[PDB]
Ligand binder design. Sequence first.
Ligand SMILES: COCCCCCCCCCN1C[C@H](O)[C@@H](O)[C@H](O)[C@H]1CO
Length: 765
Amino acid sequence: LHSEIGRLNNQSLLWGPYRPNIYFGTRPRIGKSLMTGLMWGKIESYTDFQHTVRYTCEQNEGMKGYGWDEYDPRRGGIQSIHDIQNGLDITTSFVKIPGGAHGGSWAARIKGTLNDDAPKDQKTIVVFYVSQEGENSELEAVPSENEFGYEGDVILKGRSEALGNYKLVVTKGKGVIPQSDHDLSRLRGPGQTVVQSLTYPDEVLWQAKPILFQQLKAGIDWLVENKYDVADPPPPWQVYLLANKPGSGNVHIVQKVFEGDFEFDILFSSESAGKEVTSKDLEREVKQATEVFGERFARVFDLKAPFQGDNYKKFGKSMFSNLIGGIGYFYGHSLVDRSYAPEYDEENEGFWEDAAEARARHQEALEGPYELFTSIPSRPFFPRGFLWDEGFHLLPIADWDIDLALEIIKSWYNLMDEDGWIAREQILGAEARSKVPKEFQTQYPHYANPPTLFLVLDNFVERLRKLDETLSTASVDNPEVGLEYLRRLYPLLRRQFDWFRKTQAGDIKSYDREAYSTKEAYRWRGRTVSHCLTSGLDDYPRPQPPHPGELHVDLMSWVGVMVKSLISIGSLLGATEDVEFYTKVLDAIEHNLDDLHWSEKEGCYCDATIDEFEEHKLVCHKGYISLFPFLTGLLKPDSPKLGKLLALIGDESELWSPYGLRSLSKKDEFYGTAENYWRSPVWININYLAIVQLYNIATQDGPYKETARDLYTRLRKNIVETVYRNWEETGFAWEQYNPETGKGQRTQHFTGWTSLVVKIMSGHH
Ligand SMILES: COCCCCCCCCCN1C[C@H](O)[C@@H](O)[C@H](O)[C@H]1CO
């Protein structure tokens, strides 16, 4: 029944619009298979279309905004795109229709409406691009009846081992098709839907834009060769309309030109399912998905006061739908330096120069292929898996669909190597690499990232202790299924725990250091003079200079998180020998947090280093790092230390801004310096941890119950209102928020952990 829920999950999740790096496209969760993507652009001249055409996600002045209004990867959703450059409001609806043995069928409607500013007679070129990777597979456009192209629907018939037999239809659509009265129309037709069927080596099929443009370019060269010239030139839209040549191939380009508003459907029919999908099915299934989305949201994300209003509901739906709508499937090789050069041990003073020397050996090589099914922080800027981000992403997603979240956790853990390492940043395949300067592709087996995926596991454990409907909660509702999941995952968690303690160990013994335990002390590897990228808090101030004797209190707290999880999970699996070891580790971290990291003088936790005179010194920089044992749930609710931490949190002159907690205190010497990334701005992920911890203390007997209640109430409100106000005014989630002005800044479309706001509004932690 665990093998069974698994198969049912696989079949349900197989198809999706799982290409968030592009405006709209589909692919199944199979490395080498059938992919689609949409392109569009206005054409006003002989040279403009190359600049107007849209394919991969971006954000600039030419794009008002875009995103998912509604989304559930089992059912589908509706995306809306507000394109200024192209004077178009576009809607792409996607729906899955279960049936057969190959993961079912799906349909999409593409709808374009010119905005008020666009010329009423705008010509827009629209391309549906279809590619198929695999050695023993086939795809063929059924030729037209007409001589120059298609009056009606374009049918592609194809087959592969993975998908069996299928048909993909691009429907005729609705809208004016311009007609050219030029001489060229005698050889090219007056204007109609066209299809080119081509083949390239599999590994380049993702390059849809260059491949399209190469075909457009060949058509223009034919014009020149055949005496079509500036003395009497065809209209632009006809110059850029491909000559029809349907056939067999692994690439099929379907092109339409419309004048004014337009729409057309894409109908994927899995043959093994029986009756093929129609446009009427699409409409019915689209209405039904919306109804189901609506019912689930109201239930799962029941927004509490003072955010019960309709405005907050629309806001929460946008934030949530963009988070879960970012889910992608990525496949291909990763770039990894497997030299384990000794310079990477960072055991000496000045280690960063040595590590630079090793990296300059460039021993990195491609390995894999790997796959990953994950949500992402940023469609336009970094559409790929980041390890500690995903832990936050899955917190609202798990509420919605725990089986989906567990599927993503599993996907991430399947990347763990033999030592216990998962690369913190997952750049899988040439397509993912295209978006990443080469200097930034290499992953390093000594670089960690916070184990926030344990927080998701913690939530599932609590739920376990206490057809698409059934599927989403099968792993909690059948306790047998849940436990088997944990049983199979558990050794990997254990392995990652051991990996942290082996590779990210700090040095107690070599120095004049005294502490309850000789073992518990941690130091993030990979730090440079101005950064610590592995911790997640890029440029938060750390001991200067970096030093092999540094200890990082956030890292110790994360190990605290993992060991607590391993206690709950080990206990469920009856790993008595394991649970006893974990229990002594936790006790030791509890003591060493105080012994190595507590500053009585400052009233907070601090990272530690080793002096010019070889002595332990605390280095205090009041901000998120200072709060870490509190943020990660490690302190007792009557701890006097927790009480001082609450004072720091609520202190307006330190961390407390009207817009949320500042990443660094206004009193710190490093406040608003350098790139000022984590040196003052309000970040939603850390604020979320604070809010959740305040609520815990607020809902429990103790001396700080009422302080916590007040801070909970205000912080929740301040964070939610800041994200809402910015969303209302800009249409975006932002990466971080200015604590002086309240403005969203850095990158837009950050959904992304900013989307945690849905769960903050929902409350009842
Ligand atoms: C150098 O430039 C070339 C590469 C550019 C792309 C860099 C990837 C963007 C990272 C964004 N972001 C920075 C946060 O401090 C991290 O905590 C967070 O995990 C990460 C992902 O959301």
